[PDB]
Design an enzyme around this catalytic site. Sequence first.
Site, PDB file in Angstrom:
ATOM      1  CB  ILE A 130      -2.975  -5.852   5.411  1.00  0.00           C
ATOM      2  CG1 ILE A 130      -2.170  -6.265   6.647  1.00  0.00           C
ATOM      3  CG2 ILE A 130      -4.280  -5.158   5.787  1.00  0.00           C
ATOM      4  CD1 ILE A 130      -1.460  -5.113   7.335  1.00  0.00           C
ATOM      5  CG  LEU A 163       0.664  -5.588  -8.613  1.00  0.00           C
ATOM      6  CD1 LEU A 163      -0.589  -6.385  -8.947  1.00  0.00           C
ATOM      7  CD2 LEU A 163       1.860  -6.117  -9.388  1.00  0.00           C
ATOM      8  N   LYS A 212       2.417   2.114  -9.255  1.00  0.00           N
ATOM      9  CA  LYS A 212       3.548   3.068  -9.435  1.00  0.00           C
ATOM     10  C   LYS A 212       3.472   4.168  -8.366  1.00  0.00           C
ATOM     11  CD1 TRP A 238       1.345 -12.803  -4.891  1.00  0.00           C
ATOM     12  CD2 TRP A 238       2.446 -14.723  -5.230  1.00  0.00           C
ATOM     13  NE1 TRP A 238       0.473 -13.678  -5.479  1.00  0.00           N
ATOM     14  CE2 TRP A 238       1.120 -14.867  -5.697  1.00  0.00           C
ATOM     15  CE3 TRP A 238       3.324 -15.809  -5.337  1.00  0.00           C
ATOM     16  CZ2 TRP A 238       0.658 -16.054  -6.260  1.00  0.00           C
ATOM     17  CZ3 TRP A 238       2.869 -16.976  -5.907  1.00  0.00           C
ATOM     18  CH2 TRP A 238       1.554 -17.094  -6.363  1.00  0.00           C
ATOM     19  CB  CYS A 240     -19.111  -3.932   2.377  1.00  0.00           C
ATOM     20  SG  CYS A 240     -18.387  -4.514   0.829  1.00  0.00           S
ATOM     21  N   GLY A 267       0.835  -1.219   0.000  1.00  0.00           N
ATOM     22  CA  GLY A 267       0.000   0.000   0.000  1.00  0.00           C
ATOM     23  C   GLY A 267       0.858   1.252   0.000  1.00  0.00           C
TER      24      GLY A 267
HETATM   25  C1  6RQ Z   1      -9.222  -6.200  -2.572  1.00  0.00           C
HETATM   26  C2  6RQ Z   1     -10.670  -6.613  -2.144  1.00  0.00           C
HETATM   27  C3  6RQ Z   1     -11.244  -6.116  -0.933  1.00  0.00           C
HETATM   28  C4  6RQ Z   1     -12.625  -6.487  -0.504  1.00  0.00           C
HETATM   29  N1  6RQ Z   1     -13.417  -6.105   0.685  1.00  0.00           N
HETATM   30  C5  6RQ Z   1     -14.634  -6.727   0.608  1.00  0.00           C
HETATM   31  N2  6RQ Z   1     -15.758  -6.665   1.536  1.00  0.00           N
HETATM   32  N3  6RQ Z   1     -14.642  -7.494  -0.612  1.00  0.00           N
HETATM   33  C6  6RQ Z   1     -13.382  -7.340  -1.299  1.00  0.00           C
HETATM   34  C7  6RQ Z   1     -12.802  -7.868  -2.569  1.00  0.00           C
HETATM   35  C8  6RQ Z   1     -11.478  -7.524  -2.993  1.00  0.00           C
HETATM   36  C9  6RQ Z   1     -10.876  -8.098  -4.366  1.00  0.00           C
END
Ligand code: 6RQ
Length: 285
Positions: free
Chosen positions: A129, A88, A90, A116, A262, A67
Amino acid sequence: RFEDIQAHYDVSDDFFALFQDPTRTYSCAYFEPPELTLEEAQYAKVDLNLDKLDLKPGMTLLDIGCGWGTTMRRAVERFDVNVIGLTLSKNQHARCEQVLASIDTNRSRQVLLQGWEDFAEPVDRIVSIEAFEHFGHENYDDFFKRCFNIMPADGRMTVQSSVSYHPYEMAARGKKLSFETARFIKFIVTEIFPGGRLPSTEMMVEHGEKAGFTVPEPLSLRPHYIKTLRIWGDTLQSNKDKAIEVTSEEVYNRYMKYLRGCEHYFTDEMLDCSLVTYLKPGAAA
Ligand SMILES: Cc1cc2nc(N)[nH]c2cc1C
Ligand SMILES: Cc1cc2nc(N)[nH]c2cc1C
């Protein structure tokens, strides 16, 4: 072909600045104690991960998906370790080099614009993370084999990842919500994190075990991600006008749907977030 199409969902760093904390941390925070601010909680999540890795002075920590370099800096300052970061991006690469160069240390600091798959140097410990969601199911065996092989006998790794459940893991309630959750996950891995693929906790565990790792009980960060997504949602909404100026009404509505969605599916327990520890056979007790 696929590289070109996915570019449509590229969003400027300026947009993410209108919902994230000052560290620009784009992962689950850790509200322990519950009173911590988002920013404090993001440092607490870094500490939660690093505290599991048995880091000693002069070791080298690999950060897979490093990050903006918050994790690596914290590792250098707290544990007096060398750090190698993979990204990944820049923009993140340039920022990491500057973050690490700022540090008052003689420890080695390296950031590499590579995945990786291209990294095969010896390291003592590994932290990753919320990069794992991008790796793809077909690549999990190669990932855990690589991580096992680059570490010494006492090696340890943490992987923090959002997860879903297979219907075979769920009762009648979960199976019925599976279709709605699967359609929401499709939206996330199409429009928010293109090319993404969520594991389950069971996959994260069993792939590590197949590679020869001991895997203690994963830590669920579910209630912490609910709080994180609530703050991200409330902040983006408070910054509606500025967010639309920087991008569009479409992009604002897309990220509100992502963040509110989410929080909903985490609350309904159809999504989880696992901090999984991987211990090599010779890992310290
Ligand atoms: C990088 C990433 C973070 C996420 N956080 C939630 N809730 N789904 C996700 C799917 C991906 C590919
Ligand atoms: C903002 C927005 C984006 C979407 N992308 C897909 N596939 N459905 C969507 C619905 C809304 C409201």
